[PDB]
Amino acid sequence: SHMEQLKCCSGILKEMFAKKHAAYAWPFYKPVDVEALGLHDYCDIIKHPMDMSTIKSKLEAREYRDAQEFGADVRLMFSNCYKYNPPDHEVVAMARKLQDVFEMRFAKM
Ligand SMILES: Cc1[nH]c(-c2ccccc2)cc1C(N)=O
């Protein structure tokens, strides 16, 4: 059921925003501020930017037909981090930690 799926998707994103995962989930809360120092080339490398607040708004505006469409945006957010940043950057390790939380929840639904 697509309706039951999207309510579970809202639940997964709720845990991702919770205090428990806050230590590594904070860089993915809001869209990447391209006006900040060191992020002048972000728009040149990342063509489709995605973050948790945009996903939350897209769920509320019913922009996802099913769980797979929600999952695609969550993975786009992580893939943007892996593409733009160097492999040894701290944000890449944080992305892996938050993706572990998502992948385990997304598989068990
Ligand atoms: C995903 C991501 N978030 C941030 C960030 C930086 C400062 C404050 C809030 C978010 C940077 C990146 C990145 N370098 O990819």
From Swiss-Prot:
Site for Acetylated histone binding, residues: N85
Record's disease association: Cornelia de Lange syndrome 6: A form of Cornelia de Lange syndrome, a clinically heterogeneous developmental disorder associated with malformations affecting multiple systems. It is characterized by facial dysmorphisms, abnormal hands and feet, growth delay, cognitive retardation, hirsutism, gastroesophageal dysfunction and cardiac, ophthalmologic and genitourinary anomalies. CDLS6 inheritance is autosomal dominant. A chromosomal aberration involving BRD4 is found in a rare, aggressive, and lethal carcinoma arising in midline organs of young people. Translocation t(15;19)(q14;p13) with NUTM1 which produces a BRD4-NUTM1 fusion protein.
Name of the featured protein: Bromodomain-containing protein 4
Shown stretch of the complete protein: 352 to 457 of 1362
Family classification: Belongs to the BET family.
UniProt modification remark: Phosphorylation by CK2 disrupt the intramolecular binding between the bromo domain 2 and the NPS region and promotes binding between the NPS and the BID regions, leading to activate the protein and promote binding to acetylated histones. In absence of phosphorylation, BRD4 does not localize to p53/TP53 target gene promoters, phosphorylation promoting recruitment to p53/TP53 target promoters.
Consequence of substituting N85A: Abolishes binding to acetylated histones
Subunit structure comment from the entry: Interacts with p53/TP53; the interaction is direct. Interacts (via CTD region) with CDK9 and CCNT1, acting as an associated component of P-TEFb complex. Interacts with RELA (when acetylated at 'Lys-310'). Interacts (via NET domain) with NSD3, CHD4, BICRA and ATAD5. The interaction with BICRA bridges BRD4 to the GBAF complex. Interacts (via NET domain) with JMJD6 (via JmjC and N-terminal domains); the interaction is stronger in presence of ssRNA and recruits JMJD6 on distal enhancers. Interacts with NSD3. Interacts with NIPBL. (Microbial infection) Interacts with bovine papillomavirus type 1 regulatory protein E2. This interactions may serve for the tethering of viral genomes to host mitotic chromosomes allowing successful partitioning of the viral genome during cell division.
Location in or out of the cell: Nucleus; Chromosome
Domain commentary: The NET domain mediates interaction with a number of chromatin proteins involved in transcription regulation (NSD3, JMJD6, CHD4, GLTSCR1 and ATAD5).
Record lineage: Eukaryota, Metazoa, Chordata, Craniata, Vertebrata
Further remarks about this protein from its record: JQ1, a thieno-triazolo-1,4-diazepine derivative, and I-BET, a benzodiazepine derivative, have been tested on tumors with success. Treatment with GSK1210151A (I-BET151, a I-BET derivative) has strong effets on mixed lineage leukemia and promotes myeloid differentiation and leukemia stem-cell depletion.
Cited function: Chromatin reader protein that recognizes and binds acetylated histones and plays a key role in transmission of epigenetic memory across cell divisions and transcription regulation. Remains associated with acetylated chromatin throughout the entire cell cycle and provides epigenetic memory for postmitotic G1 gene transcription by preserving acetylated chromatin status and maintaining high-order chromatin structure. During interphase, plays a key role in regulating the transcription of signal-inducible genes by associating with the P-TEFb complex and recruiting it to promoters.
Coiled-coil zones: none
Extent of the signal sequence: none
Tissues expressed in: Ubiquitously expressed.
Annotated Bromo domain residues: 4-109
